[PDB]
């Protein structure tokens, strides 16, 4: 119920429905085992089939607010030290292996958010 | 314009049992309960540089 309401608020982009949420998905795990804290927020994020996250689904879906919806989803992975493995994720399907994020954003024509 | 002519003769003397296999289209879902019976044809084109908004997959590739 929480994973899907983030990708589809994403794709039309509405950025006063993704900070409520990412502070909602945030206080989730603070009342929690707070054992495995990167490991359950990448489950959060990403498709478990498909291994699509949701800054590539950002990035496919061009709207006229995206580069404001990109900086909100990379300031919430810096205060949970997850930046890296964040942004360098990849697909695990065998017809698109190996794309990243920074495959999309170059073959979309975005200057600014590469 | 002469084999066209041809073509279109030898689909009628066929019975329809035979007509239901030899048949093009799929049935495709291009909008909110829209489904037509539509034909597939691929391009590559040089020339023109824009970004795409309209598009009915996300995942490219046949599947």
């Known amino acids: ?114 | 314009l002469q084999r066209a002519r041809t073509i279109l003769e030898f689909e009628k003397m066929l019975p329809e049992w035979l007509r239901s296999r030899f048949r093009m289209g799929e049935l495709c879902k291009v909008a909110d309960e829209d489904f037509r019976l539509c034909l597939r044809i691929n391009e590559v084109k040089w020339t023109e540089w824009k970004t795409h908004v309209s598009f009915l997959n996300e995942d490219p590739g046949p599947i």
């Open chain 1, 1 to 114: 119920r929480l994973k899907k309401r983030i990708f589809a608020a994403v794709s039309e982009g509405c950025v006063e429905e993704l900070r409520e949420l990412l502070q909602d998905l945030q206080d989730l795990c603070r009342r929690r085992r707070g054992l495995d804290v990167p490991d359950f927020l990448m489950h959060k994020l990403t498709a478990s089939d498909t291994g699509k996250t949701c800054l590539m689904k950002a990035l496919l879906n061009i709207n006229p607010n995206t580069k404001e919806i990109v900086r909100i989803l990379l300031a919430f992975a810096e205060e949970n030290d997850i930046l890296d493995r964040f942004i360098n994720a990849e697909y695990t399907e065998e017809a698109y292996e190996g794309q990243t994020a920074l495959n999309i954003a170059i073959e979309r024509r975005q200057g600014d958010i590469t």
